Ligand binder design. Structure first.
Ligand code: A1BFF
Length: 185
């Protein structure tokens, strides 16, 4: 692909983070902590899942960023509406304001309803995410496999400002402690 020129500098918003997450000082990395991270509760925090939003809000234009997923067993990545539900149980779907892909139990899937099987021959260590607000497009690219397309959501109905969306996943296995990292431009 040739979307690299729409690269944007994404930072994580501490105030949206589940209370067990540890966001690095530069706001470019996030990982699961082994306990509550000693923060007060607020209405922005994701309560049920290890999720956090980017600080940036997008309402127009073309945007591109890259995320490092090296050695993780489980994660969700993409964009979501600024107004997504924060508390309680919910599914990742366009109907709920999310445009995401994920890794879970050795399979990759797109967050449609119901979910769609992805066909990845080269397990990605970095994922590229492209958003075209006007076109209603969210695309995912396998940076490890020369930028090969993973999935395109088209005819998206964003219906509001978008924020970068992250889930570091649970670490019940002891094999999913590694961080999500926003890769340099
Ligand atoms: C992320 C979160 O809200 N919580 C609360 C309940 C217990 C969970 C245990 N953490 S785990 C999967 O072992 O890494 C962590």
């Amino acid at each position: 692909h040739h979307h690299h020129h729409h690269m944007v500098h994404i930072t994580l918003d501490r105030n949206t983070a589940n209370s067990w997450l540890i966001i690095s000082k530069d706001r470019r990395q996030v990982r699961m902590g082994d306990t509550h991270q000693n923060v007060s509760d607020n209405k922005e925090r994701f309560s049920n899942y290890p999720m956090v939003l980017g600080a940036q809000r997008f309402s127009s234009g073309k945007m591109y960023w890259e995320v490092d997923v090296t050695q993780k067993e489980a994660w969700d990545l993409g964009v979501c509406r600024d107004s997504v539900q924060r508390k309680g149980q919910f599914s990742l779907s366009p109907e709920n304001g999310f445009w995401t892909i994920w890794l879970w139990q050795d399979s990759y899937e797109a967050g449609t309803s119901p979910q769609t099987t992805l066909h990845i021959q080269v397990p990605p260590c970095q994922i590229g995410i492209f958003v075209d607000y006007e076109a209603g497009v969210v695309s995912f690219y396998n940076i490890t496999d020369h930028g090969s397309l993973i999935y395109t959501f088209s005819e998206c109905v964003f219906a509001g400002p978008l924020r970068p969306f992250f889930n570091v996943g649970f670490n019940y296995s002891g094999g999913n402690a590694a961080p999500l990292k926003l890769c340099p431009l």
